[PDB]
Structures are given as C-alpha cells and as structure tokens.
C-alpha cells in the first residue's frame, strides 16, 4: 500500500533538483497535500558503481515513512560492512572502529537509492520533469517562479531550490576550496593476481571491508563490495595545478593519484591496489565549500535554499544527504502548518529550525577536516577515539521536533518570544 496524500493544501511548490533535498521535499510535500512539480536538468539518474554513500538513521526513519516497499527495494544494495580499519600515512595500524549508526543506517550506492526514490515518486503520481534546466529565478508579491530551458515560465506559491553546490539559486539569492577528490571503481580480477595488492581481498567473501589512510594532507579510503568482486576508493587531495590561461575542461589521470601518494612512507600497499584502476572508471572532482550563509530565504520570502546549495559539507561527517533530507522534510512540514496565507512564514520558520543544526555540522566538518589531514599523532596514540567515526544527530526526528516547536518558532519570527534550539547540543559544538 502506497501512502495516500493528505487533503490538498492549495499550496503549489516548485522543487529544483533530483538530488536528496529535491526528491525529499517533493515526496514529503506531495504526501502532505501540496501540489508539487520537480525540475531536473539531467535526462536520467546517473549510475556509478563507485559512488558509495552512508545515509544516517536520522534520514532512514524519514524515508521509511514514505513506503515499506523501499526497505525491501534497497536491501540488496546495502553493504554488510561493520568496521573501518584506520591507518596512518606510514601504513601503520591505528584502530578499527564501527561505522556510525550501529547498523541502523544505510551504506549503499547513490544512483541506486536515487533511482528507487525517483520511481517511488512516480508511483505516487508526482509531476517530475527531467531535461528541464532551471534558470532566471524571479519573485513577486504572492508568487515566485523560474524559467525552464529559457523558453517556459513557471509560477507557484514558493520555490525550493536543491540544485547542489553549483547553485545558480544561491548566486541569485545572494548576488555574490583548493581541495579535490579522486573517485574510482574497479573489478578485482586483475588485482587478485598481484601479490602486492591481493591483500585487500582478505575476508571479503564474508563481509565488505573498509580501509582508510590519513596523513600529510591526504586522505584515502578503499571499500570492497560484492564478496570482493568489486571495490571503490576515494582520495581527497590538494587540487591539481592548472596554468593561468589554461584549458577549461576536466581531467583525471591515475598517475596523478599515484604521484599524490608518492611522499607517503606507507605508499606501497595503497598504491599497489589503486594502480589497477582503469582510466574510464576514474574521476577527480573539486570539492566546493562555502561558509554559512546569512540566510537561506529570499527577500520576498518565497524562494528558499536547502541541501548543498545552502550548507555544503566537507565529506567527513556522513551527513550531507541526510541533512538535505531533513531540510526537505521540515520545509514541507512547515508549509502544511502555516497554510496558504503564510507561505513566507513557513519558510522563515523552517529556516530557523534547520540553520543551527546544519551549521553546527557544517562547521564541524571544517574542524574535523583539519584534524584528519594533519593529525596530532600524540593524542591519537594516547586515545585513538578521536579519529574514529552522536545520538543528538542520529537519534533525532526532525518531523516530530518540527511539530513540537512550530508555534514557538512562529512567535519567535514574529517577535512575540524567543526560540531555544534543542535540535543541537547545548553550547552547540560538533
Ligand atoms: C566525496 C563525497 C562524499 C560524500 N559522502 C556522503 C555520504 O557518505 N553521506 C552523505 O549523506 N552525504 C555525502 N556527501 C554529500 C552528499 O553527496 C550531498 O550532500 C547531497 O547530495 C546534497 O543533496 P542535494 O540534493 O542538495 O544536492 P545534489 O544531490 O547535488 O542534487 C542537486 C541536483 O540538482 C540538479 N541541478 C543542478 N542545477 C540545476 C539546474 N539549474 N536546474 C535543474 N537541476 C539542476 C543536479 O542535476 C543535481 O541533480 C558526500 C559528498 C562528497 C563530495
């Protein structure tokens, strides 16, 4: 049984992006009685066997309330990995630690989860328009909208922008890193013949294995999949040097990834593994980071940013997509409770509920990023608990929390009172 949406709220919503924030906002809004159209520029969900992601329990509980079929749909795509073996740049063992969530989260592939959420949204009857490039955001009194493919104008009660780190909505709302990440996937047939690399296949038939190396401004993670028949890895590094007046296209070579690891005294075993990567299965994406914004909401109050467009994280917290999902849920829940004649209030309300929680984690990823690239090996040796992968994040329910505080936040925005955020730790630090 697919959940039947609530009574029509009379609220039309334009959602930009088919990522985690956009699909979340669209599905939750539809089920809460809103009239949803989702606009995405790509023609199909991109499928990459190496794009592995961790969805935390705080987002899994939200996704589960959209249909029980999803748990049985993503199950064969969930990794059975339990621990990550941390090592230094000398290739010396630090510690094994559990992955976060105590097994209540989802360690799976991105495109296969997005495809399931895309199909579930279609079964619900949500108007999803692919191949629809959004630009030229605009806003008036009572309505806001976008231009699709520079030919079609759409207008609605509000526009929720989840167009990622490369957000044109952000630039329109505001008017205003040096790191990169190798990403790769491979089969292990050729690697199994190499005795300098075959070590990575140990114990893989029983359970997926994870190895991570930290040190000297470099991070490397290797993950086995499918009983050791496949693996994926990610290498965070300083961005490749390009000339002043240089070709504006992208590039990715395994030799640069290997050269990045050359200064490591323990380079042998990691390099012996990744050197079997085929060139067609390797990318090198620059990582975007921007400090917290002054606001996620436009002046008129009917255009709002969520997800990476609002709060891009350094990928060391495993909460980017989950926080985008929390964004989409609270926004949709707030619209339902404020009503047609208070759409700007709802988005002002969702902002002050979400901004502290996403900003603590945002700044927390910036602090943890320095510690994991240039660690104090004395403190690590004294207490290895620092390196290794919080109930106030994973045990939280943004939905019921939004219901608790809605009136309190409404009175806080209007000025009747104050709002004490309790979706973050007291004296909030990550
Ligand atoms: C290396 C790395 C590892 C990560 N690991 C994790 C992890 O383990 N767990 C986790 O939770 N998060 C992780 N993240 C973060 C996670 O990838 C993002 O936070 C999440 O995708 C953000 O959701 P989103 O919906 O905002 O953005 P996106 O997923 O980026 O979605 C935006 C969508 O908008 C579309 N779009 C863009 N512009 C337009 C336009 N003009 N018109 C129409 N459509 C447009 C794009 O096609 C894209 O489909 C990681 C990030 C990185 C870089």
Q: Report how far residue 169's alpha carbon sits from residue 160's, in angstroms, rounded to the nearest whole number.
A: 9
40 and 33 Cβ atoms separated by less than 8 Å = no
* Cα–Cα nearest to 391, from 36, 40, 104, 90: 104
Residue the block writes with tokens 């029983």: 206
3-state secondary structure of 286: strand
Annotated catalytic, 92? no
348 and 360 Cβ atoms separated by less than 8 Å = no
Q: Report how far residue 158's alpha carbon sits from residue 172's, in angstroms, rounded to the nearest whole number.
A: 15
Number of folded domains that form the chain: 1
* Best residue among 149, 320, 324 to mutate for probing ligand 1, ranked by most atoms within 8 Å of CB: 320
Q: Report how far residue 357's alpha carbon sits from residue 397's, in angstroms, rounded to the nearest whole number.
A: 12
325 and 59 Cβ atoms separated by less than 8 Å = yes
Q: What are phi and psi of 196, to 5 degrees?
A: -80, -10
Query: Residue 217 has which token pair?
Result: 């401004």
45 and 118 Cβ atoms separated by less than 8 Å = yes
Q: Report how far residue 187's alpha carbon sits from residue 201's, in angstroms, rounded to the nearest whole number.
A: 11
- What is the DSSP secondary-structure string of 127-146? EEE-S--EEEEEEETTEEEE
CA max distance for the chain: 70
Sequence-ordered alpha helix ranges (H) in 10-109 = 20-31, 57-64, 69-74
Element (H, E) at 321: helix 320-338
Residue 349: count of CB within 10 angstroms of its CB: 29
Query: Residue 135 has which token pair?
Result: 């630009």
For this entry, resolution in Å reads 2.4
**Which residue in the list 32, 110, 112, 183 is annotated as catalytic?**
183
Domain extent, residue 363, equals 1-430
Q: Report how far residue 262's alpha carbon sits from residue 281's, in angstroms, rounded to the nearest whole number.
A: 21
- Gaps in the chain with C–N over 2.5 Å, residue before each: 176, 389
* Cα–Cα nearest to 67, from 17, 28, 114: 28
Residue the block writes with tokens 């490369």: 166
Centre of ligand 1 to C-alpha 167, Å, is 11
Instruction: State whether the Cα torsion 327-332-335-340 is positive or negative.
Output: positive
Which residue's C-alpha comes closest to atom 4 of ligand 1?
315
Q: Report how far residue 237's alpha carbon sits from residue 23's, in angstroms, rounded to the nearest whole number.
A: 31
277 and 186 Cβ atoms separated by less than 8 Å = yes
Q: What are phi and psi of 344, to 5 degrees?
A: -60, -35
| Number of helical (H) and strand (E) elements in the chain, helices listed first | 13, 17
Query: Residue 79 has which token pair?
Result: 């990794």
* Cα–Cα nearest to 200, from 169, 222, 167, 178: 222
- 230-238 and 218-225 as β-strands: parallel, antiparallel, unpaired? antiparallel
45 and 114 Cβ atoms separated by less than 8 Å = yes
DSSP 239: P
Q: Report how far residue 59's alpha carbon sits from residue 113's, in angstroms, rounded to the nearest whole number.
A: 13
DSSP 77: G
Centre of ligand 1 to C-alpha 140, Å, is 29
Q: Report how far residue 230's alpha carbon sits from residue 221's, in angstroms, rounded to the nearest whole number.
A: 14
235 and 267 Cβ atoms separated by less than 8 Å = no
Query: Residue 59 has which token pair?
Result: 């987002």
Query: Residue 29 has which token pair?
Result: 């809004």
CB half-sphere exposure, 335, CA atoms < 13 A: 33
CB half-sphere exposure, 316, CA atoms < 13 A: 27
Which residue's C-alpha comes closest to atom 20 of ligand 1?
321
Which residue's C-alpha comes closest to atom 52 of ligand 1?
315
13 and 34 Cβ atoms separated by less than 8 Å = yes
> Solved by what technique?
X-ray
- Residues in contact with ligand 1 by the CB-under-6-Å rule are 16-22, 39-42, 53-55, 133-134, 162-164, 168, 181, 234, 287, 307-308, 315, 318-322, 324
313 and 359 Cβ atoms separated by less than 8 Å = no
Ligand 1 atom nearest to CA at 42: 47
């Amino acid at each position: 049984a697919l959940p039947t949406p609530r009574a029509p709220t009379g609220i039309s919503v334009i959602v930009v992006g088919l990522g985690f924030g956009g699909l979340t906002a669209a599905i939750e809004s539809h089920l809460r009685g809103h009239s949803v159209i989702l606009l995405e520029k790509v023609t199909k969900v991109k499928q990459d066997a190496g794009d592995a992601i961790v969805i935390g329990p705080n987002a899994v509980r939200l996704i589960k309330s959209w249909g029980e079929q999803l748990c049985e749909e993503i199950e064969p795509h969930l990794s059975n990995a339990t621990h990550a073996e941390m090592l230094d740049h000398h290739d010396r063992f630090i510690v094994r630690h559990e992955l976060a969530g105590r097994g209540k989260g989802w360690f799976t592939n991105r495109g296969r989860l997005i495809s399931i959420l895309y199909e579930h949204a279609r079964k619900l009857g949500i108007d999803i328009r692919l191949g629809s490039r959004v630009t030229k955001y605009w806003e008036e009194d009572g309505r806001a909208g976008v231009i699709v493919n520079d030919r079609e104008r759409l207008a609605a009660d509000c526009v929720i922008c989840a167009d990622g780190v490369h957000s044109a909505a952000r630039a329109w709302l505001t008017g205003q890193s040096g790191w990169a990440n190798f990403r790769a996937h491979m089969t292990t047939e050729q690697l199994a013949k190499d005795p300098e690399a075959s070590w990575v296949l140990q114990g893989t038939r029983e359970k997926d294995r994870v190895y991570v190396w930290f040190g000297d401004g470099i991070n490397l993670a290797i993950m086995t999949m499918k009983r050791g028949q496949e693996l994926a890895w990610a290498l965070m590094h300083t961005d490749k040097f390009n000339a002043h007046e240089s070709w504006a296209g992208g590039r990715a070579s395994i030799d640069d990834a290997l050269a990045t690891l050359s200064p490591w005294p323990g380079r042998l075993r990691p390099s012996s593994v990744i050197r079997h990567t085929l060139p067609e299965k390797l990318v090198d994406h620059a990582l975007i980071y921007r400090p917290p914004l002054d606001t996620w909401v436009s002046a008129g109050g009917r255009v709002m940013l969520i997800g990476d467009a609002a709060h891009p994280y350094f990928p060391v917290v495993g909460q980017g997509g989950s926080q985008a999902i929390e964004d989409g849920v609270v926004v949709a829940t707030a619209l339902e409770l404020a009503g047609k004649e208070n759409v700007p209030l709802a988005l002002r309300v969702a902002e002050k509920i979400r901004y502290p929680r996403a900003t603590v984690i945002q700044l927390g990823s910036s602090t943890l990023q320095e510690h994991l690239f240039w660690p104090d090996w004395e403190a690590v040796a004294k207490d290895p608990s620092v390196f290794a992968f919080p109930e106030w994040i994973l045990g939280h329910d943004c939905r019921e929390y939004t219901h608790q505080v809605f009136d309190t936040v409404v009175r806080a925005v209007r000025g009747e009172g104050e709002y004490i955020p309790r979706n973050i730790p007291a004296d909030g630090a990550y």
